[PDB]
Ligand code: HEM
């Protein structure tokens with residue numbers, strides 16, 4: 001992962017990206033397509049763009065740059081928000097409480113049991129399967145943080 | 154992973170948790186501690202509790218259940234938000250556009266170059282290192298989805 005300061009630095013420069021997203025996106029795609037022309041071959045709708053000049057003149061290349069950098073920014077922000085939720089929990093459960101993954105399994109099963117007991121009319125088989133999967137992701141994600149922190153869970 | 158409706162089911166039932174978070178948290182920990190009594194040994198303040206009635210009467214246990222379910226809720230919500238944007242991108246770039254991870258590396262290189270060129274004051278060595286790390290996390294998270302989908306990338 002990234003430190004808090006590092007994520008701050010990523011978000012600060014990304015603010016500069018957002019002040020001119022289309023210009024940035026245009027420049028990123030042109031750099032990509034000039035450096036690695038095979039990548040431009042992936043875009044059938046840019047088949048008419050061959051030269052740098054034509055790439056710079058393209059309305060739709062610029063528009064696509066915006067699409068790309070808007071999507072990337074959102075994913076980077078959402079990753080950071082998730083990492084920040086995991087962080088304090090992994091910290092303490094790895095380095096202080098030392099909670100094995102098998103105990104996280106036991107609490108996950110408890111949660112499913114309680115949900116079924118308290119909401120049998122609204123926590124059917126499908127919804128139960130959804131929660132079972134979400135809790136497995138949660139445990140896997142903590143297990144990956146445990147490893148980063150040096151703890152074998 | 155979860156489909157979109159599965160995530161929604163997770164969010165929906167957590168809303169129900171949040172309407173009686175105390176009761177839900179109490180029941181979760183009672184289930185855990187009665188099913189797996191060894192887990193009680195982790196809790197200095199609970200490990201004396203033997204019966205369900207005693208566990209229900211403990212204000213400390215009840216308080217803790219709330220703390221646990223609050224924390225888990227925030228992780229689940231933030232995972233869901235990240236997945237909602239990550240999933241469609243991995244899906245289209247594996248299935249339709251067929252974009253190898255190496256081409257994501259190439260566009261990462263272009264992003265790092267463009268940011269350094271445009272914003273050197275906000276993109277010194279540490280800040281660049283942070284962005285390099287954040288784009289690797291992005292690529293790795295797409296690669297994991299690619300493996301789930303059977304796409305070589
Ligand atoms: C930071 C990495 C990237 C992001 C965030 C990104 C984002 C997007 C988004 C949001 C779309 C539109 C919706 C969709 O189809 O998913 C799209 C379309 C597409 N992407 Fe990407 N992309 C990335 C990298 C690449 C790379 C490296 C290539 C090719 C070498 C590529 C090729 C395409 C193609 C061919 C389309 C469809 C274009 C069209 O005909 O409109 N992507 N991308």
Ligand code: HEM
Pocket residue numbers: 088089092093097099103104107108192193195196220221222224225
């Ligand atoms: C859904 C899974 C879990 C969640 C969300 C969770 C959450 C929390 C939170 C938010 C705290 C307080 C702040 C902190 O120390 O991080 C905490 C404390 C603690 N947790 Fe967990 N926990 C989970 C599972 C477990 C399990 C299974 C065990 C043991 C079997 C455990 C043992 C402890 C202990 C011993 C403390 C300290 C209690 C105290 O001194 O007051 N946790 N947990």
